[PDB]
Every structure is written in C-alpha cells, then in structure tokens.
Amino acid sequence: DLRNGAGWRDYYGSLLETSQPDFTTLISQWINAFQTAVKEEYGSSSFDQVTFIKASGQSLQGFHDNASIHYPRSTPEPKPDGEAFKWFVANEKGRRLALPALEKSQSFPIKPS
RNA sequence: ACUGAAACUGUAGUAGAACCAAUCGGGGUCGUCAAUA
C-alpha cells in the first residue's frame, strides 16, 4: 500500500474507508526512474552496463561458468589440514594473480603458476 | 509625684505547562606469520 503525500491527504481526509491507489501500475515506472538516474549520473548507454550494477548483478546471479566457489587452495579437495594459505604462497611465487573483477566472472586456477 | 492596657504578619494561591531515551549497526568471516640459506 504505497501512496504519495497527496494520496495520504485523501486517506487522512476522512474516517470513512476510501480507495487506495493501485501501486502496481507505477512499480515499473519507479524502477525506470531509478534505472535512468543511474544511467545519467554514472554515464552509460545502458543501465545493465554500469559497473556496480553489472557487478551487483553477477553477485546476485552467481557465476555461470560452473566453477566451484571455495577459498583458494592448492588442491581440488578440501584436505583436512585446510592449508588455504599455500595457494597464496604458490601465487606469490607464481603468476601473482589478483582477484578478478566480479563482472568478468573469471575463475582462479588451482595452480596459480 | 509612678511602666498604659489589648492586638497571630496574617489571608487567597497545585513548582507547574510543553518534551518519544532516542538515532545508525546482517552475530559476521581467510591467508597470513616468521627470515634467511
């Protein structure tokens, strides 16, 4: 039950019941008001190409390449001793790769070397 | 070449009116640490 202040002046105008407006005609308009504002202030031809929007979208959607999500480790299995630090050791002596951009959806290799 | 006497500083009057103990905060989560040989 969303109404602007004009719609609340009507609601508080009477102690009798009165029609609420149908917000579902407007929801798409409000979303477009948001989306166009993002296109305009974070200059883009598309809303979906705005970098924090594309990044946020990839977060909510998850990664498409079906690579598993897990902390860096130098072995497919989670081995019981959990030496996740030694992927970072291999990365330091290896290709020194950084955490890829979220909107790029790039996986790490298990051997960062 | 005579102390004046007698007379409640009392009577009426609400320390009260107004004021939100409140604003913000995912019980959350990854690679570091040590320095030589």
mmCIF file of C-alpha atoms (C1' of nucleotides) in Angstrom:
data_model
loop_
_atom_site.group_PDB
_atom_site.id
_atom_site.type_symbol
_atom_site.label_atom_id
_atom_site.label_comp_id
_atom_site.label_asym_id
_atom_site.label_seq_id
_atom_site.Cartn_x
_atom_site.Cartn_y
_atom_site.Cartn_z
ATOM 1 C CA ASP A 1 0.000 0.000 0.000
ATOM 2 C CA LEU A 2 2.181 2.801 -1.366
ATOM 3 C CA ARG A 3 0.825 6.331 -1.785
ATOM 4 C CA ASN A 4 2.384 9.724 -2.226
ATOM 5 C CA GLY A 5 1.593 12.523 0.183
ATOM 6 C CA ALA A 6 -1.347 13.530 -1.983
ATOM 7 C CA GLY A 7 -2.781 10.052 -1.501
ATOM 8 C CA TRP A 8 -2.305 10.301 2.252
ATOM 9 C CA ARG A 9 -4.109 13.646 2.373
ATOM 10 C CA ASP A 10 -7.044 11.729 0.925
ATOM 11 C CA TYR A 11 -6.599 8.855 3.382
ATOM 12 C CA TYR A 12 -6.494 11.212 6.366
ATOM 13 C CA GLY A 13 -9.218 13.342 4.821
ATOM 14 C CA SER A 14 -11.901 11.012 6.112
ATOM 15 C CA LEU A 15 -12.685 8.492 8.821
ATOM 16 C CA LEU A 16 -14.639 6.511 6.244
ATOM 17 C CA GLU A 17 -12.826 3.924 4.179
ATOM 18 C CA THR A 18 -11.600 5.148 0.811
ATOM 19 C CA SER A 19 -9.887 3.710 -2.233
ATOM 20 C CA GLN A 20 -6.187 3.004 -2.078
ATOM 21 C CA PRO A 21 -4.350 3.631 -5.362
ATOM 22 C CA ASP A 22 -3.078 0.674 -7.386
ATOM 23 C CA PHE A 23 0.698 0.899 -6.968
ATOM 24 C CA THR A 24 1.289 -1.952 -9.456
ATOM 25 C CA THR A 25 0.792 0.412 -12.394
ATOM 26 C CA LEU A 26 3.693 2.513 -11.089
ATOM 27 C CA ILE A 27 6.252 -0.064 -9.915
ATOM 28 C CA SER A 28 7.811 -0.320 -13.380
ATOM 29 C CA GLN A 29 7.865 3.476 -13.604
ATOM 30 C CA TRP A 30 9.699 3.824 -10.292
ATOM 31 C CA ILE A 31 12.216 1.170 -11.309
ATOM 32 C CA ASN A 32 12.776 3.054 -14.570
ATOM 33 C CA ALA A 33 13.142 6.305 -12.633
ATOM 34 C CA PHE A 34 15.905 4.616 -10.640
ATOM 35 C CA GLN A 35 17.493 2.950 -13.659
ATOM 36 C CA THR A 36 17.577 6.125 -15.755
ATOM 37 C CA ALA A 37 19.098 8.065 -12.865
ATOM 38 C CA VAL A 38 21.911 5.511 -12.679
ATOM 39 C CA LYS A 39 22.463 5.742 -16.442
ATOM 40 C CA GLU A 40 22.579 9.520 -16.205
ATOM 41 C CA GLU A 41 24.888 10.024 -13.230
ATOM 42 C CA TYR A 42 27.168 7.055 -13.896
ATOM 43 C CA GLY A 43 27.263 7.766 -17.611
ATOM 44 C CA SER A 44 26.388 4.742 -19.699
ATOM 45 C CA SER A 45 24.308 3.842 -22.709
ATOM 46 C CA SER A 46 22.726 1.011 -20.710
ATOM 47 C CA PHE A 47 21.761 0.571 -17.084
ATOM 48 C CA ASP A 48 22.934 -3.049 -17.062
ATOM 49 C CA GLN A 49 26.404 -1.974 -18.249
ATOM 50 C CA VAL A 50 27.036 0.233 -15.201
ATOM 51 C CA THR A 51 29.952 -1.418 -13.453
ATOM 52 C CA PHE A 52 28.488 -1.588 -9.963
ATOM 53 C CA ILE A 53 25.192 -2.718 -11.490
ATOM 54 C CA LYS A 54 26.888 -5.410 -13.576
ATOM 55 C CA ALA A 55 28.977 -6.431 -10.574
ATOM 56 C CA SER A 56 25.971 -6.449 -8.256
ATOM 57 C CA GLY A 57 24.035 -8.448 -10.838
ATOM 58 C CA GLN A 58 26.778 -11.078 -11.009
ATOM 59 C CA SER A 59 26.823 -11.328 -7.217
ATOM 60 C CA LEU A 60 23.082 -11.982 -7.015
ATOM 61 C CA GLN A 61 23.084 -14.301 -10.009
ATOM 62 C CA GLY A 62 26.241 -16.257 -9.173
ATOM 63 C CA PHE A 63 28.930 -17.328 -11.583
ATOM 64 C CA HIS A 64 27.820 -19.030 -14.781
ATOM 65 C CA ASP A 65 30.972 -20.981 -15.722
ATOM 66 C CA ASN A 66 30.084 -23.739 -13.160
ATOM 67 C CA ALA A 67 33.494 -23.489 -11.493
ATOM 68 C CA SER A 68 33.132 -24.277 -7.804
ATOM 69 C CA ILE A 69 33.147 -21.498 -5.240
ATOM 70 C CA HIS A 70 35.639 -22.115 -2.454
ATOM 71 C CA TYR A 71 38.523 -20.416 -0.711
ATOM 72 C CA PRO A 72 41.856 -20.574 -2.542
ATOM 73 C CA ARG A 73 43.653 -23.858 -2.083
ATOM 74 C CA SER A 74 46.330 -25.798 -3.931
ATOM 75 C CA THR A 75 44.281 -28.985 -4.291
ATOM 76 C CA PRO A 76 40.824 -29.894 -5.640
ATOM 77 C CA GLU A 77 39.654 -31.491 -2.403
ATOM 78 C CA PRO A 78 39.335 -29.598 0.833
ATOM 79 C CA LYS A 79 42.069 -31.546 2.555
ATOM 80 C CA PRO A 80 41.570 -31.833 6.315
ATOM 81 C CA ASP A 81 44.536 -29.673 7.348
ATOM 82 C CA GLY A 82 42.982 -26.793 5.408
ATOM 83 C CA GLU A 83 46.219 -25.202 4.212
ATOM 84 C CA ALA A 84 44.461 -22.498 2.201
ATOM 85 C CA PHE A 85 47.439 -20.179 2.730
ATOM 86 C CA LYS A 86 49.651 -22.197 0.390
ATOM 87 C CA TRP A 87 47.668 -21.282 -2.700
ATOM 88 C CA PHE A 88 48.675 -17.734 -1.797
ATOM 89 C CA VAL A 89 52.259 -18.938 -1.449
ATOM 90 C CA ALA A 90 52.141 -20.507 -4.907
ATOM 91 C CA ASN A 91 50.514 -17.361 -6.281
ATOM 92 C CA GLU A 92 53.312 -15.197 -4.847
ATOM 93 C CA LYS A 93 55.990 -17.308 -6.481
ATOM 94 C CA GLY A 94 53.763 -17.910 -9.495
ATOM 95 C CA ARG A 95 51.695 -15.643 -11.691
ATOM 96 C CA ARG A 96 50.778 -13.272 -8.815
ATOM 97 C CA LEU A 97 47.188 -13.086 -9.964
ATOM 98 C CA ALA A 98 44.744 -10.689 -8.417
ATOM 99 C CA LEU A 99 41.130 -11.265 -7.564
ATOM 100 C CA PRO A 100 39.362 -10.935 -10.928
ATOM 101 C CA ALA A 101 36.713 -8.293 -11.439
ATOM 102 C CA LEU A 102 33.314 -9.610 -10.430
ATOM 103 C CA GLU A 103 31.599 -8.611 -13.680
ATOM 104 C CA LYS A 104 34.337 -10.509 -15.560
ATOM 105 C CA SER A 105 33.396 -13.845 -13.925
ATOM 106 C CA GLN A 106 36.961 -15.196 -14.259
ATOM 107 C CA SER A 107 37.928 -18.180 -12.125
ATOM 108 C CA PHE A 108 41.300 -18.698 -10.481
ATOM 109 C CA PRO A 109 43.417 -21.710 -11.391
ATOM 110 C CA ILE A 110 44.076 -24.273 -8.697
ATOM 111 C CA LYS A 111 47.807 -23.927 -9.536
ATOM 112 C CA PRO A 112 48.384 -20.173 -9.840
ATOM 113 C CA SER A 113 51.710 -20.729 -11.557
ATOM 114 C "C1'" A B 1 4.971 62.897 92.137
ATOM 115 C "C1'" C B 2 4.682 56.253 89.410
ATOM 116 C "C1'" U B 3 5.908 51.051 83.232
ATOM 117 C "C1'" G B 4 -0.849 52.069 79.790
ATOM 118 C "C1'" A B 5 -3.960 48.072 78.624
ATOM 119 C "C1'" A B 6 -5.323 44.838 74.497
ATOM 120 C "C1'" A B 7 -3.956 43.129 69.342
ATOM 121 C "C1'" C B 8 -1.463 35.747 65.494
ATOM 122 C "C1'" U B 9 2.211 39.443 59.938
ATOM 123 C "C1'" G B 10 -1.841 37.002 58.664
ATOM 124 C "C1'" U B 11 -5.480 35.848 54.363
ATOM 125 C "C1'" A B 12 -6.086 33.578 48.936
ATOM 126 C "C1'" G B 13 -2.602 30.949 45.511
ATOM 127 C "C1'" U B 14 -1.172 22.703 42.736
ATOM 128 C "C1'" A B 15 6.527 24.272 41.051
ATOM 129 C "C1'" G B 16 3.604 23.784 37.029
ATOM 130 C "C1'" A B 17 2.761 23.506 31.184
ATOM 131 C "C1'" A B 18 5.205 21.506 26.783
ATOM 132 C "C1'" C B 19 9.040 17.451 25.565
ATOM 133 C "C1'" C B 20 9.203 9.539 22.384
ATOM 134 C "C1'" A B 21 15.647 7.818 25.898
ATOM 135 C "C1'" A B 22 16.061 8.076 21.130
ATOM 136 C "C1'" U B 23 19.096 7.755 16.133
ATOM 137 C "C1'" C B 24 22.897 4.229 12.979
ATOM 138 C "C1'" G B 25 24.874 -1.001 13.037
ATOM 139 C "C1'" G B 26 23.477 -8.751 8.786
ATOM 140 C "C1'" G B 27 26.460 -12.392 15.108
ATOM 141 C "C1'" G B 28 29.865 -11.677 10.885
ATOM 142 C "C1'" U B 29 34.100 -14.012 8.206
ATOM 143 C "C1'" C B 30 40.544 -16.447 5.030
ATOM 144 C "C1'" G B 31 45.811 -16.232 4.374
ATOM 145 C "C1'" U B 32 48.551 -14.826 6.929
ATOM 146 C "C1'" C B 33 53.113 -15.357 10.175
ATOM 147 C "C1'" A B 34 58.391 -15.840 10.918
ATOM 148 C "C1'" A B 35 63.721 -14.872 7.988
ATOM 149 C "C1'" U B 36 67.229 -16.381 5.976
ATOM 150 C "C1'" A B 37 70.329 -20.095 3.150
#
